[PDB]
Amino acid sequence: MNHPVESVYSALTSILLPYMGEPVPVQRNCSCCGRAPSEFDGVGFELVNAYRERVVHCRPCQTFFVSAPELMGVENPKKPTTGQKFGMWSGVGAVINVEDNSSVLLAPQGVVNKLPEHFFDHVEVITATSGQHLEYLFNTELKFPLIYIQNFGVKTYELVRSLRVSLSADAIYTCADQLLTRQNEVLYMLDLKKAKELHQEIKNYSKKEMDIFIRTVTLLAYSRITPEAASNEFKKNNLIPLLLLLPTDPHQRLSILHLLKKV
Amino acid sequence: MRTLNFNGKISTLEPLTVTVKNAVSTSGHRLPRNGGFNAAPYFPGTSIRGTLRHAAHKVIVDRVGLNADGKSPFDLAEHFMLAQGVDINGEAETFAPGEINAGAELRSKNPLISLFGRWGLSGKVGIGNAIPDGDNQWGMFGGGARSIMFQRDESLMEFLETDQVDRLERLLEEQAEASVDISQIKTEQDALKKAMKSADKDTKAELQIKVRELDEKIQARKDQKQESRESIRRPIDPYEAFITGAELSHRMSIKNATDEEAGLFISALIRFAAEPRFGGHANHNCGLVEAHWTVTTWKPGELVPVTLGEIVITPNGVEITGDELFAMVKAFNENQSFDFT
Amino acid sequence: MRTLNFNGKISTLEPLTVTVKNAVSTSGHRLPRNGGFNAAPYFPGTSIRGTLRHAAHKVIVDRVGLNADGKSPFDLAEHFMLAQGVDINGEAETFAPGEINAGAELRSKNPLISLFGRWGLSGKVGIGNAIPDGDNQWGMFGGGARSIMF
Amino acid sequence: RMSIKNATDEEAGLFISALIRFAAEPRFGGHANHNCGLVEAHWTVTTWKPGELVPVTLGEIVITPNGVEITGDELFAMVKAFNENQSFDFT
Amino acid sequence: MLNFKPYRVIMSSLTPVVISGIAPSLDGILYEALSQAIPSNEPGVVLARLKEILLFNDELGVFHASSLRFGITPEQGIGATTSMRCDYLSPEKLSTAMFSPRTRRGLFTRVLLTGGPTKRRMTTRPAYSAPYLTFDFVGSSEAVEILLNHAHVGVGYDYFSAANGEFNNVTILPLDIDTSISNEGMALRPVPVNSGLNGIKGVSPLIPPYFVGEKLNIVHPAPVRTQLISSLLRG
DNA sequence: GGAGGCCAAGATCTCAAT
Ligand SMILES: [Zn+2]
């Protein structure tokens, strides 16, 4: 119910509800999401993965493992009858508007080509590679709260446990197939508001000065130049006002720079 | 129930090296560093922990022995539980997250899992890094250069027949031609790279596109080669390592060590001494070390260390000093309740 | 199945030199150093390993036999595999990771490739560097000058 | 220092035979035009059974310009095991 | 319960530090050190002893022990590194001398290493590399010196297994003002939200061990804070 | 005849360098 996967299901992956089949009464947790059975109403899907494991899935988690070739195309011609799955879509992202219950797929050109005509009536698809996600997030007037899936990936279980709802532009949680522990949550948070502020204030400086700033912050973040040398460079090119906008965290600095260089 | 702190040194009889993904750049191979290229390196405690966990696993395998048919009594699931700590079939006990002192029965029956934990059970053995003492105790060892065995020793040509000599000549010619062609492609790629920074934002894409296409042209050129896909003559890249005779400070601990778990750890260190090497590049006999640890504990009721003994590992043997350590080893050897399955 | 450790010394009868690509500079020819520019030199374990590997290769070549013409049964590929440890035809029995007892049969049948190994097969032999015992046991040799003989 | 990890009798015998053949031309390195590289070496062979506290010396290999000296019955046993095993396929 | 004076501890960082969302606090390190010294894991006992060497603020329910603050020199500043942990399945581990694999046609079924339950785990975490690590506290300098020097504790996450946050050269120098909880109205450690202190909001326990107990709404400083080592030594 | 096991296939691309 009140789980991030339900929001993804309703907004995006309820399209293949007709092909799911009927559930079975189950007595164990959903290994995919781990939530208690009390939010399943006792029904779930029994599945065997290629590793020969008996995993129980709720309805929202099952949509990542459902093959509907007539709806989602086919990903590998060697296996004609197995369609593209949300649980196997490497390189495909999605921005999900929870309140409006609408979703926006960010698929690359190859995946878009593989998609049949019937797909586009149900899901709005944007042609954008993995590197072009940042452009879409930057330019689009985002509606919050939203779930932004950066990469559906192949490791569904870790994607499902890592789904988080972004309440504001301060903290957009980029969700991928990598497990979101508290030790690596700095890599999967994007300070869009501060990046946009820095981009707005980066326009006052020259292109050469901007490149110097980006290279100096990147080298300093990787312990490649001494702080004294970086400070001398910043003073020389008058980049001190820019430096005060960056977070002290080097990983946040690198995320913000990666966003600036893409937009 | 006491904490056993192992403080000591590790002296490298041979260069000591380790390959870590984030420390090995494309510019060269480097040891792990806590900072830039001017920082002093260290030998990861993860590598030492893995080596000692394998030694403890070998101790357990030797102790348990082999079945009547001669096959090891551990299946794949138990093997990965003892070795990597993962449970592959989902049959492991899942303790409640609230408590800390969990798995008391499992810790009592399986000393290896108690020392080195599994997923869901914290391990009592902490193994720290090997921090160097000096300031110039690392250097770029290895290196060398692969040669052609027939261009170096002419007596080897007498063994080859005429067809094989012709094949060798074709191989050398192909190697030279491919070297020249690939050098030209790399030159063009580098020319693209130099103007890449000066390139405009729109041009940032297709320059990378041509670099990519140049890369697969190199791959296709090497695929066109028939006698050999790889040039036999090539410079070998050196690896960074700690020099011979480097002194590295090492700290190890066992938290709440029973006599049996500490005995298993001492036995692992004893068995580790038969082949006492960390790290890789064993082809150059790298990694061989000698270490001496001062086993100490905490005085009950106050913050005062108490020395229990000392473990010295040398090429000439293992010296265990201290009656307490022998008591731990004997307690491990005499226990008849352990079940590692 | 035992571990044998060869601990000993190498005594020098004639000057011992080696040209390592990363050790020599434009300033001059230098021996590889035991870490740093001012440390004691050493003789690389790579050179000793290569010399002993080729010696073992010739042991194998002599043991297999030479025909009346003095030719060995091994083609070019076998010679390269046994001495250089490189395969040219691409027929080396690549062991996918996860194989249980990966080199068992190859090691049992080919003691040379078991000792010294190849890519994908760890060699059992590790031959370390040679470290001098004292100081100032190295110096600049060679020298001289070519001259018009007339 | 040299070592063979988990060496059978046959592989140790091959290594010892390599050392014996190396003694005929005990040359390391380059600049052989000045006869650089001649060496004489002696190695003490020891084995260490895991689980025990001390190693045991098997013998000694001495390479000198006057000959090759190998001591200890274990090294001779290794060489004989290599020279008398006919199940080796090197191709 | 003793004559507790405010101290600042500065240690040299030897290994990159992995921060579990909330910056490590010195009371956590001292709790681990005392859990090793006292051969007991009971939180009640360790906390009862920890209060003898760290001042406990009853009003807020937190120890006078500041969180981590990286000390940067002009030679080296706060850097970005990853903590790499991998499964090394050596030929010894994949051998029949250790386990008996399942057999088909006499051949041994290979371990599927690219994925599954038996995959090589390439677990990587963000880490921070700075020359110095600095904590502020009010307590017995002798006991904290002994615990930091002799116990098996690091600064950060999972020092026991990975040896992240290894440190040495622990230097303790007395302070003039207690800067362990508050400084100019900004919280320097996880404090209750009702304390009136400013900082990043979050959910965490107030006393160690921080992985055990009900998680209240707290206010904590930024996880990665840096201060110049010259300004730290000023005292 | 599942049932074990292998092997090939699936999107596009990652700048830090004494
Ligand atoms: Zn679920």
Author numbering:
A (entry chain G): 1 to 263
B (entry chain A): 1 to 341
C (entry chain B): 1 to 150
D (entry chain B): 251 to 341
E (entry chain F): 1 to 235
What does the article say, verbatim?
Type IV-A CRISPR-Cas systems diverge from this general mechanism, using a nuclease-independent interference pathway to suppress gene expression for gene regulation and plasmid competition. Here, we present several cryo-EM structures of two evolutionary distant type IV-A1 and type IV-A3 complexes (from Pseudomonas oleovorans and Klebsiella pneumoniae, respectively) bound to cognate DNA targets with and without DinG. The structures reveal multisubunit DNA-surveillance complexes that intimately recognize their DNA-targets to form an R-loop structure. Our results support a model in which DNA-binding is achieved analogously to type I Cascade, while recruitment of DinG differs mechanistically, even in closely related subtypes.
Cryo-EM structure determination of the resulting complexes revealed the effector complexes at average resolutions of ~3.0 Å (type IV-A1) and ~2.9 Å (type IV-A3). Five Cas7 subunits assemble a helical filament along the crRNA spine in type IV-A1, while six subunits form the Cas7-backbone in type IV-A3. The low local resolution of the type IV-A3 effector complex around Cas6 indicates flexibility and prevented model building of Cas6, the predicted crRNA hairpin and some segments of the terminal Cas7.6. However, in type IV-A3, a more pronounced arginine rich loop (RRL; arginines 102, 104, 105 and 110), extending from the Cas5 thumb, inserts into the minor groove of the PAM-adjacent dsDNA. For PAM sequence recognition, Cas8 aligns a loop emanating from its Znf to the minor groove to identify the PAM base pair in position 2, with lysine 79 probing dT2 of the TS. While type IV-A1 stacks a wedge residue onto the PAM base pair in position 0, type IV-A3 Cas8 positions valine 154 and methionine 88 in the minor groove adjacent to the base pair in position 0. Lysine 155 of Cas8 and lysine 119 of Cas5 clamp in place the rotated phosphate that connects the PAM and dG1 of the TS, which together bend the TS for sequence interrogation. Similar to type IV-A1, the structure of type IV-A3 revealed a cryo-EM density corresponding to the NTS (through nucleotide position 8) atop the C-terminal domain of Cas8. Different from type IV-A1, we found α-helices 8 and 9, originating from the thumb domain of Cas7.1, extending from the back of the type IV-A3 effector complex to interlock with the CTD of Cas8. This NTS-interaction mode fully encloses the NTS in a positively charged channel.
